[PDB]
Amino acid sequence: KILHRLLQD
Amino acid sequence: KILHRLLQD
Amino acid sequence: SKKNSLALSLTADQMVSALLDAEPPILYSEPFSEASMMGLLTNLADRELVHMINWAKRVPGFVDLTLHDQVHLLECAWLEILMIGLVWRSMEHPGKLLFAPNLLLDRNQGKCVEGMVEIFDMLLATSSRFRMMNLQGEEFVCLKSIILLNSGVYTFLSSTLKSLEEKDHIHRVLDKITDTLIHLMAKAGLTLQQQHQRLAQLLLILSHIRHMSNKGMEHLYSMKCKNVVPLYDLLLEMLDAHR
Amino acid sequence: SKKNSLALSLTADQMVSALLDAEPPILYSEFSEASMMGLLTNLADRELVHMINWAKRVPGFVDLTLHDQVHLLECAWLEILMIGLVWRSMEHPGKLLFAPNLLLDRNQGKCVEGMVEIFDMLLATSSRFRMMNLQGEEFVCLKSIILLNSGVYTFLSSTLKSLEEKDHIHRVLDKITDTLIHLMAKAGLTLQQQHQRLAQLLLILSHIRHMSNKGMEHLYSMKCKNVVPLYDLLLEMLDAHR
Numbered sequence: 001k002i003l004h005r006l007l008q009d
Numbered sequence: 010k011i012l013h014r015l016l017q018d
Numbered sequence: 019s020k021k022n023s024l025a026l027s028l029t030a031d032q033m034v035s036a037l038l039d040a041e042p043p044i045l046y047s048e049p050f051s052e053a054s055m056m057g058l059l060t061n062l063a064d065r066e067l068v069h070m071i072n073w074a075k076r077v078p079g080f081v082d083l084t085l086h087d088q089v090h091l092l093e094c095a096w097l098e099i100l101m102i103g104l105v106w107r108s109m110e111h112p113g114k115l116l117f118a119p120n121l122l123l124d125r126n127q128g129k130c131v132e133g134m135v136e137i138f139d140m141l142l143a144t145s146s147r148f149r150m151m152n153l154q155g156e157e158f159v160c161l162k163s164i165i166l167l168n169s170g171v172y173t174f175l176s177s178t179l180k181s182l183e184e185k186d187h188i189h190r191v192l193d194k195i196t197d198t199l200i201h202l203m204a205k206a207g208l209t210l211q212q213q214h215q216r217l218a219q220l221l222l223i224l225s226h227i228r229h230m231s232n233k234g235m236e237h238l239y240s241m242k243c244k245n246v247v248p249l250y251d252l253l254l255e256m257l258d259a260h261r
Numbered sequence: 262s263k264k265n266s267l268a269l270s271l272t273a274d275q276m277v278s279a280l281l282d283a284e285p286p287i288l289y290s291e292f293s294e295a296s297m298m299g300l301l302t303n304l305a306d307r308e309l310v311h312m313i314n315w316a317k318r319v320p321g322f323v324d325l326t327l328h329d330q331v332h333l334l335e336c337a338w339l340e341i342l343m344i345g346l347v348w349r350s351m352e353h354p355g356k357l358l359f360a361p362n363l364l365l366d367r368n369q370g371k372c373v374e375g376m377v378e379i380f381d382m383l384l385a386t387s388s389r390f391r392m393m394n395l396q397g398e399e400f401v402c403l404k405s406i407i408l409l410n411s412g413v414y415t416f417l418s419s420t421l422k423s424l425e426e427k428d429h430i431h432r433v434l435d436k437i438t439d440t441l442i443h444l445m446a447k448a449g450l451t452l453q454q455q456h457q458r459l460a461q462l463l464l465i466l467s468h469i470r471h472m473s474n475k476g477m478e479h480l481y482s483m484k485c486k487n488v489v490p491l492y493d494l495l496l497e498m499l500d501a502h503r
Protein backbone atom coordinates (compact mmCIF):
# COMPACT_ATOMS: atom_id res chain seq x y z
CA LYS A 1 0.00 0.00 0.00
CA ILE A 2 2.78 2.55 0.73
CA LEU A 3 4.09 2.08 -2.81
CA HIS A 4 0.58 2.77 -4.07
CA ARG A 5 0.32 5.96 -2.03
CA LEU A 6 3.65 7.25 -3.29
CA LEU A 7 2.84 6.46 -6.92
CA GLN A 8 -0.42 8.45 -6.81
CA ASP A 9 1.06 11.41 -4.95
CA LYS B 10 32.91 -35.91 -9.81
CA ILE B 11 30.49 -37.21 -12.50
CA LEU B 12 30.73 -33.84 -14.24
CA HIS B 13 34.50 -34.27 -14.31
CA ARG B 14 34.51 -37.77 -15.79
CA LEU B 15 31.93 -36.78 -18.41
CA LEU B 16 33.88 -33.63 -19.26
CA GLN B 17 37.06 -35.65 -19.86
CA ASP B 18 35.22 -38.48 -21.61
CA SER C 19 -6.48 1.59 -26.85
CA LYS C 20 -4.71 4.81 -25.89
CA LYS C 21 -3.01 7.00 -28.48
CA ASN C 22 0.74 6.47 -28.61
CA SER C 23 2.61 7.64 -25.55
CA LEU C 24 4.59 10.85 -26.01
CA ALA C 25 7.58 8.92 -24.65
CA LEU C 26 7.87 7.14 -28.07
CA SER C 27 8.36 10.48 -29.84
CA LEU C 28 11.61 11.40 -28.12
CA THR C 29 14.82 11.38 -30.07
CA ALA C 30 17.90 9.56 -28.62
CA ASP C 31 19.34 12.81 -27.20
CA GLN C 32 15.95 13.62 -25.67
CA MET C 33 15.70 10.24 -23.87
CA VAL C 34 19.16 10.70 -22.46
CA SER C 35 18.35 14.17 -21.08
CA ALA C 36 15.11 12.85 -19.62
CA LEU C 37 17.02 10.03 -17.89
CA LEU C 38 19.84 12.26 -16.59
CA ASP C 39 17.32 14.83 -15.34
CA ALA C 40 15.37 12.13 -13.48
CA GLU C 41 18.35 10.81 -11.44
CA PRO C 42 17.40 10.66 -7.74
CA PRO C 43 19.18 12.74 -5.08
CA ILE C 44 22.56 11.54 -3.77
CA LEU C 45 22.24 10.36 -0.14
CA TYR C 46 24.55 9.94 2.83
CA SER C 47 24.42 7.12 5.31
CA GLU C 48 23.48 7.82 8.92
CA PRO C 49 32.83 -0.84 14.21
CA PHE C 50 30.03 -3.00 12.91
CA SER C 51 28.11 -5.90 14.38
CA GLU C 52 25.90 -8.19 12.25
CA ALA C 53 22.88 -6.15 13.37
CA SER C 54 24.68 -2.80 13.06
CA MET C 55 25.88 -3.18 9.47
CA MET C 56 22.57 -4.59 8.21
CA GLY C 57 21.04 -1.60 9.98
CA LEU C 58 23.10 0.83 7.86
CA LEU C 59 22.47 -0.78 4.46
CA THR C 60 18.77 -1.36 5.13
CA ASN C 61 18.27 2.16 6.37
CA LEU C 62 20.02 3.40 3.20
CA ALA C 63 17.86 1.12 1.08
CA ASP C 64 14.48 2.20 2.53
CA ARG C 65 15.33 5.93 2.10
CA GLU C 66 16.53 5.20 -1.47
CA LEU C 67 13.29 3.35 -2.18
CA VAL C 68 11.33 6.56 -1.47
CA HIS C 69 13.37 8.45 -4.11
CA MET C 70 13.19 5.53 -6.54
CA ILE C 71 9.39 5.88 -6.63
CA ASN C 72 9.90 9.48 -7.80
CA TRP C 73 12.67 8.55 -10.24
CA ALA C 74 10.41 5.93 -11.82
CA LYS C 75 7.66 8.47 -12.45
CA ARG C 76 10.07 10.46 -14.60
CA VAL C 77 11.29 7.59 -16.72
CA PRO C 78 9.55 8.12 -20.04
CA GLY C 79 6.62 5.82 -20.57
CA PHE C 80 6.31 4.61 -16.99
CA VAL C 81 3.44 6.93 -15.99
CA ASP C 82 1.43 5.78 -19.00
CA LEU C 83 1.08 2.34 -17.38
CA THR C 84 -1.79 1.45 -15.05
CA LEU C 85 -0.86 2.10 -11.41
CA HIS C 86 -1.09 -1.63 -10.72
CA ASP C 87 1.45 -2.42 -13.48
CA GLN C 88 3.60 0.49 -12.17
CA VAL C 89 3.50 -1.23 -8.77
CA HIS C 90 4.35 -4.57 -10.31
CA LEU C 91 7.41 -3.20 -12.14
CA LEU C 92 8.86 -1.48 -9.00
CA GLU C 93 8.27 -4.58 -6.82
CA CYS C 94 10.07 -6.78 -9.29
CA ALA C 95 12.95 -4.43 -10.00
CA TRP C 96 13.71 -2.46 -6.85
CA LEU C 97 16.70 -4.54 -5.66
CA GLU C 98 18.31 -4.72 -9.09
CA ILE C 99 17.99 -0.92 -9.35
CA LEU C 100 19.68 -0.31 -5.99
CA MET C 101 22.31 -2.86 -6.92
CA ILE C 102 23.11 -1.35 -10.29
CA GLY C 103 23.54 2.13 -8.72
CA LEU C 104 25.81 0.62 -6.15
CA VAL C 105 28.01 -1.06 -8.78
CA TRP C 106 28.11 2.25 -10.69
CA ARG C 107 29.21 4.20 -7.64
CA SER C 108 31.87 1.64 -6.81
CA MET C 109 33.50 1.46 -10.28
CA GLU C 110 36.39 3.72 -9.15
CA HIS C 111 36.82 1.93 -5.77
CA PRO C 112 38.47 -1.42 -6.58
CA GLY C 113 37.78 -4.00 -3.85
CA LYS C 114 35.19 -1.74 -2.19
CA LEU C 115 31.49 -0.99 -2.29
CA LEU C 116 30.44 2.62 -2.03
CA PHE C 117 27.01 2.27 -0.47
CA ALA C 118 27.26 6.09 -0.05
CA PRO C 119 30.02 8.75 -0.20
CA ASN C 120 30.49 8.38 3.57
CA LEU C 121 30.07 4.57 3.69
CA LEU C 122 32.73 2.74 1.68
CA LEU C 123 32.89 -0.89 2.83
CA ASP C 124 35.86 -3.23 2.22
CA ARG C 125 35.12 -6.68 0.82
CA ASN C 126 36.20 -8.23 4.16
CA GLN C 127 33.63 -6.03 6.01
CA GLY C 128 30.99 -8.17 4.26
CA LYS C 129 32.19 -11.13 6.39
CA CYS C 130 30.65 -9.33 9.44
CA VAL C 131 27.20 -10.40 8.13
CA GLU C 132 26.28 -14.05 7.70
CA GLY C 133 26.19 -14.79 3.97
CA MET C 134 26.96 -11.25 2.81
CA VAL C 135 30.51 -11.91 1.52
CA GLU C 136 29.26 -13.97 -1.39
CA ILE C 137 26.88 -11.13 -2.29
CA PHE C 138 29.64 -8.55 -1.98
CA ASP C 139 31.92 -10.56 -4.28
CA MET C 140 29.36 -10.72 -7.12
CA LEU C 141 28.64 -7.00 -6.53
CA LEU C 142 32.40 -6.39 -6.78
CA ALA C 143 32.78 -8.56 -9.86
CA THR C 144 30.01 -6.65 -11.59
CA SER C 145 31.78 -3.53 -10.51
CA SER C 146 35.02 -4.63 -12.23
CA ARG C 147 33.29 -5.67 -15.44
CA PHE C 148 31.88 -2.14 -15.65
CA ARG C 149 35.38 -0.68 -15.16
CA MET C 150 36.70 -2.99 -17.85
CA MET C 151 34.12 -1.68 -20.34
CA ASN C 152 34.52 1.97 -19.34
CA LEU C 153 30.80 2.10 -18.72
CA GLN C 154 29.43 5.65 -19.32
CA GLY C 155 26.84 7.40 -17.13
CA GLU C 156 24.58 7.96 -20.10
CA GLU C 157 24.86 4.18 -20.74
CA PHE C 158 24.35 3.48 -17.05
CA VAL C 159 21.06 5.48 -16.91
CA CYS C 160 19.77 3.68 -19.97
CA LEU C 161 20.52 0.33 -18.27
CA LYS C 162 18.85 1.33 -15.03
CA SER C 163 15.57 2.20 -16.87
CA ILE C 164 15.78 -0.94 -19.02
CA ILE C 165 15.82 -2.78 -15.69
CA LEU C 166 12.74 -0.97 -14.35
CA LEU C 167 10.68 -1.71 -17.51
CA ASN C 168 11.98 -5.25 -18.30
CA SER C 169 12.23 -7.24 -15.08
CA GLY C 170 8.48 -7.41 -14.28
CA VAL C 171 7.24 -7.35 -17.85
CA TYR C 172 6.78 -11.15 -18.08
CA THR C 173 4.98 -11.72 -14.77
CA PHE C 174 2.07 -9.35 -15.14
CA LEU C 175 -0.81 -11.01 -13.26
CA SER C 176 -3.10 -10.98 -16.34
CA SER C 177 -3.94 -12.06 -19.86
CA THR C 178 -6.43 -9.28 -20.59
CA LEU C 179 -6.29 -7.19 -23.79
CA LYS C 180 -5.29 -4.24 -21.58
CA SER C 181 -2.23 -6.22 -20.36
CA LEU C 182 -1.27 -6.91 -23.99
CA GLU C 183 -1.65 -3.21 -24.50
CA GLU C 184 0.65 -2.43 -21.52
CA LYS C 185 3.33 -4.99 -22.45
CA ASP C 186 3.46 -3.78 -26.02
CA HIS C 187 3.92 -0.24 -24.75
CA ILE C 188 6.72 -1.36 -22.40
CA HIS C 189 8.47 -3.09 -25.28
CA ARG C 190 8.26 0.05 -27.43
CA VAL C 191 9.90 2.21 -24.71
CA LEU C 192 12.49 -0.55 -24.33
CA ASP C 193 13.10 -0.28 -28.08
CA LYS C 194 13.56 3.49 -27.79
CA ILE C 195 16.14 2.90 -25.07
CA THR C 196 17.96 0.38 -27.22
CA ASP C 197 17.99 2.97 -30.01
CA THR C 198 19.30 5.53 -27.47
CA LEU C 199 22.12 3.14 -26.39
CA ILE C 200 23.09 2.56 -30.03
CA HIS C 201 23.08 6.31 -30.69
CA LEU C 202 25.35 7.08 -27.70
CA MET C 203 27.73 4.46 -29.03
CA ALA C 204 27.77 5.74 -32.63
CA LYS C 205 28.30 9.29 -31.42
CA ALA C 206 31.28 7.94 -29.47
CA GLY C 207 32.92 6.61 -32.64
CA LEU C 208 32.36 2.89 -32.32
CA THR C 209 32.03 0.99 -35.54
CA LEU C 210 28.69 -0.74 -36.20
CA GLN C 211 30.12 -4.12 -35.07
CA GLN C 212 31.53 -2.43 -32.02
CA GLN C 213 28.09 -0.96 -31.26
CA HIS C 214 26.23 -4.31 -31.60
CA GLN C 215 28.87 -6.02 -29.42
CA ARG C 216 28.72 -3.39 -26.63
CA LEU C 217 24.91 -3.51 -26.53
CA ALA C 218 25.00 -7.26 -25.90
CA GLN C 219 27.90 -6.89 -23.49
CA LEU C 220 25.78 -4.44 -21.39
CA LEU C 221 22.49 -6.40 -21.66
CA LEU C 222 24.21 -9.67 -20.60
CA ILE C 223 25.35 -7.94 -17.40
CA LEU C 224 21.60 -7.55 -16.68
CA SER C 225 21.31 -11.35 -16.21
CA HIS C 226 24.05 -11.05 -13.60
CA ILE C 227 22.22 -8.20 -11.83
CA ARG C 228 18.98 -10.17 -11.79
CA HIS C 229 20.92 -13.03 -10.17
CA MET C 230 22.52 -10.73 -7.53
CA SER C 231 19.02 -9.42 -6.79
CA ASN C 232 17.49 -12.91 -6.39
CA LYS C 233 20.17 -13.94 -3.86
CA GLY C 234 19.97 -10.58 -2.09
CA MET C 235 16.20 -11.02 -1.77
CA GLU C 236 16.80 -14.47 -0.23
CA HIS C 237 19.49 -13.04 2.00
CA LEU C 238 17.23 -10.14 2.99
CA TYR C 239 14.42 -12.55 3.72
CA SER C 240 16.66 -14.65 5.98
CA MET C 241 17.82 -11.55 7.84
CA LYS C 242 14.14 -10.62 8.33
CA CYS C 243 13.51 -14.13 9.73
CA LYS C 244 16.47 -13.88 12.18
CA ASN C 245 15.22 -10.48 13.47
CA VAL C 246 18.14 -8.32 12.35
CA VAL C 247 16.43 -5.98 9.88
CA PRO C 248 14.83 -2.91 11.44
CA LEU C 249 11.15 -2.33 10.76
CA TYR C 250 11.28 -0.17 7.64
CA ASP C 251 7.77 -0.14 6.21
CA LEU C 252 8.51 0.72 2.57
CA LEU C 253 11.49 -1.67 2.49
CA LEU C 254 9.45 -4.33 4.36
CA GLU C 255 6.52 -3.90 2.00
CA MET C 256 8.61 -4.40 -1.16
CA LEU C 257 10.27 -7.45 0.40
CA ASP C 258 6.93 -9.22 0.84
CA ALA C 259 6.15 -8.69 -2.86
CA HIS C 260 8.72 -11.43 -3.58
CA ARG C 261 7.58 -13.89 -0.90
CA SER D 262 49.24 -16.99 -22.92
CA LYS D 263 47.40 -19.24 -25.37
CA LYS D 264 47.38 -18.48 -29.09
CA ASN D 265 43.94 -17.45 -30.35
CA SER D 266 41.24 -20.09 -30.24
CA LEU D 267 40.19 -21.37 -33.64
CA ALA D 268 36.60 -20.65 -32.60
CA LEU D 269 37.27 -16.91 -33.16
CA SER D 270 38.00 -17.37 -36.86
CA LEU D 271 34.61 -18.92 -37.73
CA THR D 272 32.28 -16.95 -39.94
CA ALA D 273 28.70 -16.13 -38.93
CA ASP D 274 27.41 -19.03 -41.09
CA GLN D 275 30.07 -21.45 -39.71
CA MET D 276 29.16 -20.58 -36.12
CA VAL D 277 25.52 -21.35 -36.91
CA SER D 278 26.48 -24.63 -38.57
CA ALA D 279 28.55 -25.65 -35.56
CA LEU D 280 25.78 -24.89 -33.03
CA LEU D 281 23.11 -26.73 -35.04
CA ASP D 282 25.45 -29.70 -35.37
CA ALA D 283 26.05 -29.88 -31.67
CA GLU D 284 22.34 -30.09 -30.77
CA PRO D 285 21.86 -32.90 -28.19
CA PRO D 286 19.53 -35.77 -28.99
CA ILE D 287 15.75 -35.44 -28.58
CA LEU D 288 14.57 -37.51 -25.58
CA TYR D 289 11.24 -39.08 -24.62
CA SER D 290 10.02 -39.35 -21.07
CA GLU D 291 9.76 -42.68 -19.29
CA PHE D 292 0.28 -37.83 -11.22
CA SER D 293 1.09 -37.35 -7.56
CA GLU D 294 3.43 -34.70 -6.11
CA ALA D 295 6.11 -37.42 -6.03
CA SER D 296 5.14 -38.94 -9.40
CA MET D 297 5.20 -35.77 -11.50
CA MET D 298 8.48 -34.61 -9.92
CA GLY D 299 9.76 -38.12 -10.74
CA LEU D 300 9.20 -37.64 -14.47
CA LEU D 301 10.68 -34.10 -14.82
CA THR D 302 13.68 -34.83 -12.62
CA ASN D 303 14.29 -38.10 -14.44
CA LEU D 304 14.13 -36.22 -17.74
CA ALA D 305 16.46 -33.55 -16.38
CA ASP D 306 19.09 -36.04 -15.20
CA ARG D 307 19.21 -37.73 -18.64
CA GLU D 308 19.29 -34.37 -20.44
CA LEU D 309 22.19 -33.25 -18.26
CA VAL D 310 24.36 -36.10 -19.56
CA HIS D 311 23.76 -35.06 -23.17
CA MET D 312 24.28 -31.44 -22.09
CA ILE D 313 27.84 -32.31 -21.12
CA ASN D 314 28.48 -33.42 -24.71
CA TRP D 315 26.58 -30.51 -26.29
CA ALA D 316 28.76 -28.17 -24.22
CA LYS D 317 31.95 -29.72 -25.62
CA ARG D 318 30.87 -28.87 -29.14
CA VAL D 319 30.10 -25.23 -28.57
CA PRO D 320 32.98 -23.35 -30.13
CA GLY D 321 35.44 -22.11 -27.52
CA PHE D 322 34.21 -24.13 -24.59
CA VAL D 323 36.94 -26.79 -24.86
CA ASP D 324 39.70 -24.12 -24.73
CA LEU D 325 38.79 -23.27 -21.14
CA THR D 326 40.35 -25.04 -18.20
CA LEU D 327 38.39 -28.11 -17.00
CA HIS D 328 37.73 -26.23 -13.79
CA ASP D 329 36.18 -23.24 -15.63
CA GLN D 330 34.22 -25.63 -17.86
CA VAL D 331 32.86 -27.18 -14.67
CA HIS D 332 31.96 -23.81 -13.31
CA LEU D 333 30.06 -22.72 -16.50
CA LEU D 334 27.94 -25.89 -16.61
CA GLU D 335 27.25 -25.63 -12.85
CA CYS D 336 25.95 -22.10 -13.15
CA ALA D 337 23.86 -22.57 -16.30
CA TRP D 338 22.43 -26.09 -16.55
CA LEU D 339 18.94 -25.13 -15.28
CA GLU D 340 18.69 -22.15 -17.61
CA ILE D 341 19.90 -24.47 -20.44
CA LEU D 342 17.12 -26.99 -19.81
CA MET D 343 14.67 -24.15 -19.29
CA ILE D 344 15.42 -22.43 -22.55
CA GLY D 345 15.10 -25.66 -24.53
CA LEU D 346 11.84 -26.30 -22.82
CA VAL D 347 10.41 -22.87 -23.70
CA TRP D 348 11.57 -23.46 -27.26
CA ARG D 349 9.89 -26.86 -27.56
CA SER D 350 6.73 -25.36 -25.97
CA MET D 351 6.37 -22.34 -28.32
CA GLU D 352 3.68 -24.01 -30.50
CA HIS D 353 1.74 -25.42 -27.52
CA PRO D 354 0.02 -22.43 -25.92
CA GLY D 355 -0.85 -23.08 -22.27
CA LYS D 356 1.35 -26.19 -22.19
CA LEU D 357 4.93 -27.11 -21.44
CA LEU D 358 6.34 -29.77 -23.72
CA PHE D 359 8.87 -31.46 -21.41
CA ALA D 360 9.12 -34.15 -24.16
CA PRO D 361 7.20 -35.21 -27.29
CA ASN D 362 5.30 -37.75 -25.18
CA LEU D 363 5.00 -35.53 -22.08
CA LEU D 364 2.95 -32.37 -22.59
CA LEU D 365 1.77 -30.92 -19.27
CA ASP D 366 -1.12 -28.51 -18.76
CA ARG D 367 -0.71 -25.37 -16.70
CA ASN D 368 -3.16 -26.78 -14.09
CA GLN D 369 -1.14 -30.04 -13.89
CA GLY D 370 1.63 -27.90 -12.32
CA LYS D 371 -0.70 -27.31 -9.34
CA CYS D 372 -0.16 -31.03 -8.52
CA VAL D 373 3.29 -30.01 -7.20
CA GLU D 374 3.64 -27.53 -4.34
CA GLY D 375 5.13 -24.28 -5.62
CA MET D 376 5.28 -25.40 -9.27
CA VAL D 377 2.42 -23.47 -10.84
CA GLU D 378 4.27 -20.17 -10.40
CA ILE D 379 7.24 -21.75 -12.16
CA PHE D 380 5.02 -23.06 -14.98
CA ASP D 381 3.52 -19.61 -15.44
CA MET D 382 6.90 -17.92 -15.88
CA LEU D 383 7.82 -20.77 -18.16
CA LEU D 384 4.65 -20.33 -20.22
CA ALA D 385 5.13 -16.57 -20.40
CA THR D 386 8.63 -16.97 -21.63
CA SER D 387 7.17 -19.30 -24.20
CA SER D 388 4.50 -16.78 -25.33
CA ARG D 389 7.09 -14.02 -25.59
CA PHE D 390 9.16 -16.30 -27.87
CA ARG D 391 6.04 -16.97 -30.01
CA MET D 392 5.38 -13.28 -30.33
CA MET D 393 8.94 -12.60 -31.59
CA ASN D 394 8.83 -15.48 -34.02
CA LEU D 395 12.06 -16.80 -32.50
CA GLN D 396 13.99 -18.84 -35.10
CA GLY D 397 16.01 -21.99 -34.24
CA GLU D 398 19.22 -20.45 -35.51
CA GLU D 399 18.48 -17.60 -33.07
CA PHE D 400 17.68 -20.12 -30.33
CA VAL D 401 21.04 -21.95 -30.67
CA CYS D 402 22.87 -18.67 -30.41
CA LEU D 403 20.97 -17.87 -27.19
CA LYS D 404 21.40 -21.26 -25.62
CA SER D 405 25.21 -20.99 -26.16
CA ILE D 406 25.25 -17.39 -24.92
CA ILE D 407 23.72 -18.82 -21.71
CA LEU D 408 26.46 -21.43 -21.49
CA LEU D 409 29.31 -18.87 -21.73
CA ASN D 410 27.64 -15.89 -19.97
CA SER D 411 26.10 -17.12 -16.69
CA GLY D 412 29.21 -18.14 -14.76
CA VAL D 413 31.66 -15.67 -16.28
CA TYR D 414 31.36 -13.13 -13.40
CA THR D 415 31.60 -15.74 -10.65
CA PHE D 416 34.89 -17.54 -11.24
CA LEU D 417 36.15 -16.25 -7.83
CA SER D 418 39.76 -16.31 -8.94
CA SER D 419 41.88 -13.29 -9.74
CA THR D 420 44.78 -14.85 -11.60
CA LEU D 421 46.21 -13.83 -14.98
CA LYS D 422 44.93 -17.20 -16.18
CA SER D 423 41.39 -16.22 -15.05
CA LEU D 424 41.57 -12.93 -16.92
CA GLU D 425 42.76 -14.83 -19.90
CA GLU D 426 39.78 -17.24 -19.64
CA LYS D 427 37.13 -14.53 -19.26
CA ASP D 428 38.64 -12.57 -22.14
CA HIS D 429 38.39 -15.69 -24.27
CA ILE D 430 34.73 -16.19 -23.22
CA HIS D 431 33.85 -12.56 -24.02
CA ARG D 432 35.41 -12.95 -27.48
CA VAL D 433 33.32 -16.09 -28.23
CA LEU D 434 30.30 -14.14 -26.86
CA ASP D 435 31.11 -11.35 -29.34
CA LYS D 436 31.33 -13.86 -32.18
CA ILE D 437 27.84 -15.10 -31.23
CA THR D 438 26.47 -11.57 -31.15
CA ASP D 439 27.92 -11.04 -34.64
CA THR D 440 26.20 -14.28 -35.75
CA LEU D 441 22.91 -13.13 -34.23
CA ILE D 442 23.13 -9.86 -36.20
CA HIS D 443 24.09 -11.66 -39.45
CA LEU D 444 21.10 -14.00 -39.19
CA MET D 445 18.95 -10.88 -38.74
CA ALA D 446 20.37 -8.91 -41.65
CA LYS D 447 20.15 -12.02 -43.84
CA ALA D 448 16.42 -12.13 -42.95
CA GLY D 449 16.07 -8.52 -44.23
CA LEU D 450 15.69 -6.73 -40.91
CA THR D 451 16.63 -3.08 -41.00
CA LEU D 452 19.71 -1.99 -39.01
CA GLN D 453 17.44 -0.44 -36.36
CA GLN D 454 15.36 -3.63 -36.35
CA GLN D 455 18.43 -5.88 -35.87
CA HIS D 456 19.66 -3.79 -32.89
CA GLN D 457 16.10 -3.90 -31.47
CA ARG D 458 15.71 -7.68 -31.74
CA LEU D 459 19.17 -8.38 -30.26
CA ALA D 460 18.21 -6.49 -27.14
CA GLN D 461 14.74 -8.10 -27.08
CA LEU D 462 16.38 -11.57 -27.20
CA LEU D 463 19.10 -10.77 -24.62
CA LEU D 464 16.67 -9.25 -22.03
CA ILE D 465 14.70 -12.50 -22.04
CA LEU D 466 17.95 -14.04 -20.68
CA SER D 467 17.33 -12.08 -17.43
CA HIS D 468 13.89 -13.68 -17.16
CA ILE D 469 15.41 -17.08 -17.81
CA ARG D 470 18.08 -16.50 -15.17
CA HIS D 471 15.23 -15.60 -12.82
CA MET D 472 13.20 -18.78 -13.64
CA SER D 473 16.37 -20.75 -13.05
CA ASN D 474 17.01 -19.16 -9.64
CA LYS D 475 13.45 -19.94 -8.50
CA GLY D 476 13.70 -23.43 -9.95
CA MET D 477 16.92 -24.14 -8.01
CA GLU D 478 15.19 -22.89 -4.84
CA HIS D 479 12.21 -25.15 -5.58
CA LEU D 480 14.49 -28.02 -6.60
CA TYR D 481 16.31 -27.74 -3.27
CA SER D 482 13.06 -27.76 -1.28
CA MET D 483 11.82 -30.83 -3.20
CA LYS D 484 15.11 -32.51 -2.17
CA CYS D 485 14.63 -31.49 1.49
CA LYS D 486 11.03 -32.80 1.59
CA ASN D 487 12.12 -36.15 0.12
CA VAL D 488 9.46 -35.94 -2.60
CA VAL D 489 11.96 -37.07 -5.22
CA PRO D 490 14.77 -39.60 -4.83
CA LEU D 491 17.23 -37.58 -6.94
CA TYR D 492 19.87 -39.27 -9.04
CA ASP D 493 23.59 -38.59 -8.89
CA LEU D 494 24.31 -36.20 -11.78
CA LEU D 495 21.24 -34.09 -11.02
CA LEU D 496 21.91 -34.17 -7.25
CA GLU D 497 25.55 -33.29 -8.00
CA MET D 498 24.60 -30.13 -9.96
CA LEU D 499 22.16 -28.95 -7.29
CA ASP D 500 24.88 -28.99 -4.65
CA ALA D 501 26.92 -26.50 -6.74
CA HIS D 502 24.29 -23.83 -5.96
CA ARG D 503 23.84 -24.65 -2.26
Ligand SMILES: Oc1ccc(-c2cc3ccc(O)cc3s2)cc1
Pocket residue numbers: 059060062063066100101103104117137234235237238239241
Ligand atom coordinates in the same frame (compact mmCIF):
# COMPACT_ATOMS: atom_id res chain seq x y z
O1 LIG E 1 22.21 1.42 -2.75
C1 LIG E 1 22.04 0.23 -2.06
C2 LIG E 1 21.62 0.20 -0.75
C3 LIG E 1 21.44 -0.98 -0.02
C4 LIG E 1 21.75 -2.16 -0.66
C5 LIG E 1 21.57 -3.50 -0.03
C6 LIG E 1 22.16 -4.71 -0.45
C7 LIG E 1 21.76 -5.88 0.32
C8 LIG E 1 22.14 -7.20 0.23
C9 LIG E 1 21.59 -8.15 1.10
C10 LIG E 1 20.66 -7.76 2.08
O2 LIG E 1 20.08 -8.68 2.96
C11 LIG E 1 20.27 -6.42 2.17
C12 LIG E 1 20.81 -5.49 1.31
S1 LIG E 1 20.53 -3.82 1.24
C13 LIG E 1 22.17 -2.15 -1.99
C14 LIG E 1 22.33 -0.97 -2.69
Ligand SMILES: Oc1ccc(-c2cc3ccc(O)cc3s2)cc1
Pocket residue numbers: 301302304305308342343345346359379476479480481483
Ligand atom coordinates in the same frame (compact mmCIF):
# COMPACT_ATOMS: atom_id res chain seq x y z
O1 LIG F 1 13.98 -30.25 -20.17
C1 LIG F 1 13.67 -29.91 -18.87
C2 LIG F 1 13.42 -30.87 -17.90
C3 LIG F 1 13.09 -30.46 -16.61
C4 LIG F 1 12.99 -29.10 -16.31
C5 LIG F 1 12.64 -28.74 -14.91
C6 LIG F 1 11.94 -27.70 -14.32
C7 LIG F 1 11.86 -27.76 -12.86
C8 LIG F 1 11.25 -26.92 -11.97
C9 LIG F 1 11.31 -27.18 -10.60
C10 LIG F 1 11.99 -28.31 -10.14
O2 LIG F 1 12.02 -28.52 -8.77
C11 LIG F 1 12.63 -29.19 -11.03
C12 LIG F 1 12.55 -28.91 -12.37
S1 LIG F 1 13.19 -29.76 -13.66
C13 LIG F 1 13.25 -28.17 -17.29
C14 LIG F 1 13.58 -28.57 -18.57
